[PDB]
Swiss-Prot record:
Phosphoserine: residues carrying this PTM: 18
Regions crossing the membrane: none
PTM remark: Phosphorylated by STK24/MST3 and this results in inhibition of its activity.
Native organism: Homo sapiens (Human)
Role this protein plays: Dephosphorylates a range of proteins, and thereby regulates cellular signaling cascades. Dephosphorylates cellular tyrosine kinases, such as ERBB2 and PTK2B/PYK2, and thereby regulates signaling via ERBB2 and PTK2B/PYK2. Selectively dephosphorylates ERBB2 phosphorylated at 'Tyr-1112', 'Tyr-1196', and/or 'Tyr-1248'.
Residues of the full protein shown: 2 to 301 of 780
Stated name of the protein: Tyrosine-protein phosphatase non-receptor type 12
Mutagenesis or variant effect for residue 66 to A: Nearly abolishes enzyme activity
Residues noted as binding substrate in the record, renumbered to the chain: 35, 62-66, 198, 230-236, 277
Domain Tyrosine-protein phosphatase, residue spans: 27-292
Family (UniProt): Belongs to the protein-tyrosine phosphatase family. Non-receptor class 4 subfamily.
Reported effect, residue 199 to A: Decreases enzyme activity
Species lineage: Eukaryota, Metazoa, Chordata, Craniata, Vertebrata
Disulfide bonds: none
C-alpha cells in the first residue's frame, strides 16, 4: 500500500535528523558521500566533459569547474547566422517516464543567450523555471533574457522575446513570454523563484511546492523538457528536479517500497554534475518530500 510507504518515508526522514557516533546527522553523512563520488567522477573519466573543454567553448561556461557531461549534454542542431556550434552548458535529466524530462542548464551569459533560445526552440520547451536572481550578493548570476514587464520586445536575433504578462505569487513570479522565430510562435511560461539564495536554502519551502504545483498545471507531463536553471545549473536546479520527479511519482501512485532519495540524487549526479550542491539543499529535498507525503495523507 502506498499509504504505508509514505508513512515509513516520513519516519525515515525524522530519523535522519539524529547525529550518529561521529556527531553527524544522516544528511551531512549522505552529502559527503555524494560529494566524494562527484570529487571522484571526473578523475576516472567515467563521464568525460570533452566538448565543454574545447578552446572555442571556454567562453560559454559561466563557472570553470562546472561542465556538461558529454553523455547527457544537450546538443544544439538549430543553425543561426550568429552561432552554429552544437554546444550549451546544459544536460538532460530523466523523469519518471521521459528521458528528456528536464534540461538543467546554467544561467546564460551575455554571449550564450542565443544558445539558450536555440535550445528552448529546438526542444519544444514551454516551461522555464529560474531559481536565482539576476544579481545575488553583489555578483551577476544570470543574464536577463526576458523584457521587463511593460517594456517592448527584446531581440537576440533570430529570436524576438516578448513579455505578455507577469503575475506575482509568494516568493516567485510567473511571466508569460512569447517566443518567435521565422513564421512561428510559441507561448512560454517562466517561473522565477526569487527567494532561494545561492548555496543556501529559503527559510521555508511551502512556496517552492506551490510553484512546482502551479507550473505542473501549465505542463503536467514529460513529453517535452521543462528547462530549469539557477546560476550554475546544479544546486537549486537539482533540488527542484528531485522534488518535481518525486511529486510526479507520488501523483502516479508509484512511490517504491523503501524509497531512497540518496539513490535518486546519486543518479541525478551522473546526469548533471553536482546536482544538489550542499548538505542544506540535500536536507531540504528530504524535508520537502516528507511534507508532500504528509499533505497527501491528509486527503485519505
Amino acid at each position: 500500500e502506498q499509504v504505508e510507504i509514505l508513512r515509513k518515508f516520513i519516519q525515515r526522514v525524522q530519523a535522519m535528523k539524529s547525529p550518529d557516533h561521529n556527531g553527524e546527522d544522516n544528511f551531512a553523512r549522505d552529502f559527503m558521500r555524494l560529494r566524494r563520488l562527484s570529487t571522484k567522477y571526473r578523475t576516472e573519466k567515467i563521464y568525460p566533459t570533452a566538448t565543454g573543454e574545447k578552446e572555442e567553448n571556454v567562453k560559454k561556461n559561466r563557472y570553470k569547474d562546472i561542465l556538461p557531461f558529454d553523455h547527457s549534454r544537450v546538443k544544439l542542431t538549430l543553425k543561426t547566422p550568429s552561432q552554429d556550434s552544437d554546444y550549451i552548458n546544459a544536460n538532460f535529466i530523466k523523469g519518471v517516464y521521459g528521458p528528456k524530462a528536464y534540461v538543467a542548464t546554467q544561467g546564460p551569459l551575455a554571449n550564450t543567450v542565443i544558445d539558450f533560445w536555440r535550445m528552448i526552440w529546438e526542444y519544444n520547451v514551454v516551461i522555464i523555471v529560474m531559481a536565482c536572481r539576476e544579481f545575488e550578493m553583489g555578483r551577476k548570476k544570470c543574464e536577463r533574457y526576458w523584457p521587463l514587464y511593460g517594456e517592448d520586445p527584446i531581440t537576440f536575433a533570430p529570436f524576438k522575446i516578448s513579455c505578455e504578462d507577469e503575475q506575482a505569487r509568494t516568493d516567485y513570479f510567473i511571466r508569460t513570454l512569447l517566443l518567435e522565430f521565422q513564421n512561428e510562435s510559441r507561448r512560454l511560461y517562466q517561473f522565477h523563484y526569487v527567494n532561494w539564495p545561492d548555496h543556501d536554502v529559503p527559510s521555508s519551502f511551502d512556496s517552492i511546492l506551490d510553484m512546482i504545483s502551479l507550473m505542473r498545471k501549465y505542463q503536467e507531463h514529460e513529453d517535452v523538457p521543462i528547462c530549469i536553471h539557477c546560476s550554475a545549473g546544479c544546486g537549486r536546479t537539482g533540488a527542484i528536479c528531485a522534488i518535481d520527479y518525486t511529486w510526479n511519482l507520488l501523483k502516479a501512485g508509484k512511490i517504491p517500497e523503501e524509497f531512497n532519495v540518496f539513490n535518486l540524487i546519486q543518479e541525478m549526479r551522473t546526469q548533471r554534475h553536482s546536482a544538489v550542491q550542499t548538505k542544506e539543499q540535500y536536507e531540504l529535498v528530504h524535508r520537502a518530500i516528507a511534507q508532500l507525503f504528509e499533505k497527501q495523507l491528509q486527503l485519505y
